[PDB]
Write a protein that binds this ligand. Structure first.
Ligand SMILES: Nc1ncnc2c1ncn2[C@@H]1O[C@H](COP(=O)(O)OP(=O)(O)O)[C@@H](O)[C@H]1O
Ligand SMILES: Nc1ncnc2c1ncn2[C@@H]1O[C@H](COP(=O)(O)OP(=O)(O)O)[C@@H](O)[C@H]1O
Ligand SMILES: Nc1ncnc2c1ncn2[C@@H]1O[C@H](COP(=O)(O)OP(=O)(O)O)[C@@H](O)[C@H]1O
Ligand SMILES: [Mg+2]
Ligand SMILES: [Mg+2]
Ligand SMILES: [Mg+2]
Lengths: 371, 172, 371, 371
């Protein structure tokens, strides 16, 4: 039987079958409910919408994300998305296929215990397993050593691994990712008169951030350039036909990733965290970790971010070492791609948590068979 | 038959692995535990030579170091009722194990192996050679039940805790 | 004139006058600077706060510790700390009183030379002397024989002393103390959903550790006991009114002292370090050392840690020997009390490093006249 | 057939085919077990790394030395090392090649008895012989009279040999060797802020000691020069790119060979041990034993140690006598070369020990047949 890999990200849900190269279904992880009163009878009205269908009707809906900062909050909404994932996107029966799930490191244990119960009772899967997202990223890259920086919609974390051995005391986590940048852009866009308050408009801003933002190699010099001429200004067309023009906001939004103090956070930037993560490891493995920086996740897709990270890490590291940043073009699906490989290993088939094992031990069995 | 067997006080300390290595994906808790026990029963020089040799031979037969020897012993121990000599040897091993001066440390190491790496996950269906050894280290026999892990789904605390970092990116 | 004693520990500063039975000023050694942008004129006019003032205003400051693992790393902040201790806490002019400082063994030699230079130039003390913390702790016990286990916020070290003679080749030092335990408690508090990331939240976690942690006599039975019922659970109120409940985390955090492998360190526990340090002495003094374990420092007052230490050493020592642990209730100030006694002796007034003696020899003089 | 020589020392295992000028396999006697958690499938499945792979992967391992201070302690690790030497480095069948092992003087009898039992039972070796190391060293030197100072990583021993007649009552043994010097260097590099506490750091500090230390002709004079200027200071590159500089630690580390008071030992220096070793022999051979100081082993390789030895012995010796130090450049492998010589002499094949003899006499045969 074919295994299922379903990466419940904060922003997007990536699902597919093990052995495939790309996820079959990628839809936003939102659940929308109407906020007006219907007047026209005789047409199909549903109390809720899930996924793409919710996006197309976002002008009349209130969109809510059932996952925040990496931890699932609205379980009833979360159950709906899985049901939509298994029946409307994949057209399969979960009672026949094993499922492999993903989770950020250092999440509360209650989060993964519920993921076991909601899959062995609500959907009745034959078996399931929970894996660390950062590790799955390394599998897709075809390596066995390095330091992984996976930054998605909710959580940015680092996991240094040497020869298949991780160093848990060196794992770093930050609650600073794409959803926080979208809220920041939605704030500095009020500088030019653009206002976006509704959840429908936050989706519009999230699209603006994707298609126009980039990371400048030098912040000061770029700021002076955008303040000198109108070279950096670009135009965007709103869905109602109005046109907006932005200048220095293009590279100010992703700068928070390196200077978190913009949004009031006291933590250091990702480049310092990656350096700080390396120095917590053993002295003999720092040479390899410098040359094997692996990135994955949507927040890494900004143009020029690999160069900016390359410049910053070099300054903090000694002059002798060589810094290499690895950003494969398809890193937006690296976690899922590694998930398909891992579920397709013949050796991995002994690590599943079967239905029989769960009934003997309860939801707590997920803490022992899963890292 | 094994009177006067003196052992080093801290011979087996260097053998127990780190707690972090217990959760290794490929970790043989059984073999590491048996290696720790094997180190714990090494005869010293103070022991007279004939009894020392005899105990060394018994230990080599029951607690070897090669993987093939351990596997063969485990396979031949499934139907143990047809080898009364193995019964006698195991009983003799139990008698000397139960009088080990470092029994408490050995018992706590066994409990740590059971809890962290899951030494006894079959909860009563464990190997015979492990059963008698554990019975020697802990005579109550309560290891048949299990480590009695903890659960978080009973919601003893309704949580609803919003700290500084969680207060910024608050939804609803 | 009256001598001054100032124990610039890793976490707390103890100061007072010689001949007194208790310190006169005890404040945490933190220097904080604002991290938000001030808006009201005439109210935001200070640059940095020292001691209790930083603790009270920690909501809008970034708290930094000028000592890391017993070694001073930010000398300007240390100058501020000493200035505050001399002027605002003790209200004395340092130019009229000799000072006695404290230092851990096996500390970098540059650390004490700069201490001498700062004292003899910036503050112009008439004379000063540096003493090993563990030796002073033995003075305030009415004994001249024993092994001292001093464990503060930064450094845990052992010093065996027999009939007034120290065995320096048997001095053991370990970089595992209260700050590491607080960090570990912060790391494992995320298992129940409580996330603390900022320095103020680090102080909150430290207070929780001080108030609700205890050392289990038998770790595995205690873990079973807490996992079988809810008897060990206790409630703590966060400063904003929220309530947190902790379980096995009460005795898991102090357990790292005996099993340093939890936090990724390879060194052995405190009991094994004590045993190794004793076994490196001469065979004719081990019997007296087993009977005179002296424990001092803030990390030492976990409830029941004395019984656990005694049980461990009993397991490690031969049967015929008697193990006695000496833990007076005032061991948070044993080092300071001993320093007060030593500066009050009439046989000590000849070992001060006078101002003239420093000018003739330079900062290297503190290596000769001090141990 | 061709004979095997396997010099088992505490530090380095030197092995090779007899009748050859130089060894073929030199690998450190280190057994390593993984320390951190393994998280990736397929990577791992190796309980113990032994030999050189235990030096490549030091970042994730704990390195234990099976043969401390000469006496083998962890017999299972020794068995693993012997298996590795016979089956991987030499690539030879142990049952088709006579072997030869070495042992220091004054070792416990149980050690060599267990050695013989392992060699004749586990490996089914056809024949074997145990020889004292320094006699082999003298064999390699091509002489028949002289006093040999062998100093390796575990044990420093002396034996005076005159015309092939050894004097057992003049043999001196001292448990002060290379590993103690490395640990002392560890305790002394802390004076510059450098901290090394783990086993991989142990190997790094040992490498520093090998590559930078030297023996000063006048310790008091050299100490003044180091404190006066910076000509003696050198630089070394740590594996992770940091640069360290050491000064008087270059010649204070090897001084412990002459003043064991540095590490707290009451025994006398190696020069005075050699002097005493000669005064315990008969008066008519002292003249010859002054003129044939043969020295071998890695710890003897320090630059200038021969000259300091010569000066010290000349200071102790009578004015008329001629002190000559013989330090062949290949003295790092003198023991192995002497084993190769002795295993190829015709008059030696009657001094073997054979399984047929073993079965009749038991492990006690080794003391009766060997010296
Ligand atoms: N080309 C792009 N440029 C900048 N940001 C992007 C781009 N594509 C996606 N993102 C952002 O990445 C975020 C997270 O995407 P994803 O990798 O699916 O997160 P997760 O790992 O939680 O599934 C989204 O919120 C989106 O805004
Ligand atoms: N009752 C207590 N229980 C547990 N830990 C405590 C207690 N009181 C203080 N501590 C801890 O002891 C640590 C060091 O205190 P202290 O002895 O003042 O250090 P130092 O020796 O560096 O001055 C503090 O960081 C604090 O967290
Ligand atoms: N070039 C060198 N300079 C100084 N010390 C050395 C050198 N080479 C080896 N050593 C020391 O010699 C020790 C062991 O060398 P060796 O003679 O092989 O020991 P053994 O006799 O036990 O085999 C090592 O610990 C190392 O510190
Ligand atoms: Mg994700
Ligand atoms: Mg202190
Ligand atoms: Mg040797």
């Amino acid at each position: 039987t074919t295994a299922l890999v379903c990466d419940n990200g904060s922003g997007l849900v990536k699902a597919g079958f093990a052995g495939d190269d790309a996820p079959r279904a990628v839809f936003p992880s939102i659940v929308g409910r109407p906020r007006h009163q219907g007047v026209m009878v005789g047409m199909g009205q549903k109390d809720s919408y899930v996924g793409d269908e919710a996006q197309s009707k976002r002008g009349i809906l209130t969109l809510k994300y059932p996952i925040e900062h990496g931890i699932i909050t609205n379980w009833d909404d979360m159950e709906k998305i899985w049901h939509h994932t298994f029946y409307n996107e994949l057209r399969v029966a979960p009672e026949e296929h094993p499922t492999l799930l993903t989770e950020a490191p250092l999440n509360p244990k209650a989060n993964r215990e519920k993921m076991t119960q909601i899959m062995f009772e609500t959907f009745n899967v034959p078996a399931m397993y929970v894996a660390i997202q950062a590790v799955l990223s390394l599998y897709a890259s075809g390596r066995t050593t390095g330091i992984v920086l996976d930054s998605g919609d909710g959580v940015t974390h680092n996991v240094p691994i040497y020869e298949g051995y991780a160093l848990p005391h060196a794992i770093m986590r930050l609650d600073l990712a794409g959803r926080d940048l979208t809220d920041y852009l939605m704030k500095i866009l009020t500088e030019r008169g653009y206002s976006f308050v509704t959840t429908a408009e936050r989706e519009i801003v999230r699209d603006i951030k994707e298609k126009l933002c980039y990371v400048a190699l030098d912040f000061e010099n770029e700021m002076a350039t955008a303040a000198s001429s109108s070279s950096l200004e670009k135009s965007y067309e709103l869905p109602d036909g109005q046109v907006i023009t932005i200048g220095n906001e293009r590279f100010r939004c992703p700068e928070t990733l390196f200077q978190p103090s913009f949004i009031g956070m006291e933590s250091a930037g990702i480049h310092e965290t990656t350096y700080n993560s390396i120095m917590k490891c053993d002295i003999d493995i720092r040479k390899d970790l410098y040359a094997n920086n692996v990135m994955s996740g949507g927040t890494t897709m900004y143009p020029g971010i690999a160069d900016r990270m390359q410049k910053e890490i070099t300054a903090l590291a000694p002059s002798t070492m060589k810094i290499k940043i690895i950003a494969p073009p398809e890193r937006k699906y690296s976690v899922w791609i590694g998930g398909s490989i891992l579920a397709s290993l013949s050796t991995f088939q002994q690590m599943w948590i079967t239905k029989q094992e769960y009934d003997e031990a309860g939801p707590s069995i997920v803490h022992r068979k899963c890292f | 038959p094994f009177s006067g067997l003196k052992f080093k006080q801290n011979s087996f300390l260097s053998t127990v692995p780190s707690v972090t290595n217990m959760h290794s994906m490929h970790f043989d808790a059984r073999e590491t535990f048996l290696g720790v026990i094997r180190k714990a029963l090494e005869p010293d020089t103070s022991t007279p030579f004939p009894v020392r040799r005899a105990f060394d031979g018994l230990r080599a037969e029951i607690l070897p170091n090669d993987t093939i020897k351990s596997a063969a012993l485990k396979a031949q121990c499934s139907d143990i009722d047809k080898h009364p000599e193995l019964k006698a040897k195991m009983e003799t091993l139990k008698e000397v194990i139960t009088h080990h001066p470092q029994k408490e440390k050995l018992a706590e190491i066994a409990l740590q192996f059971a809890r962290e790496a899951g030494l006894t996950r079959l909860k009563g269906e464990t190997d015979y050679v492990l059963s008698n050894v554990l019975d020697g280290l802990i005579g109550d026999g309560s290891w048949r039940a299990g480590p009695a892990y903890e659960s978080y789904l009973n919601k003893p605390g309704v949580d609803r805790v919003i700290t500084t970092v969680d207060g910024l990116h608050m939804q609803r």
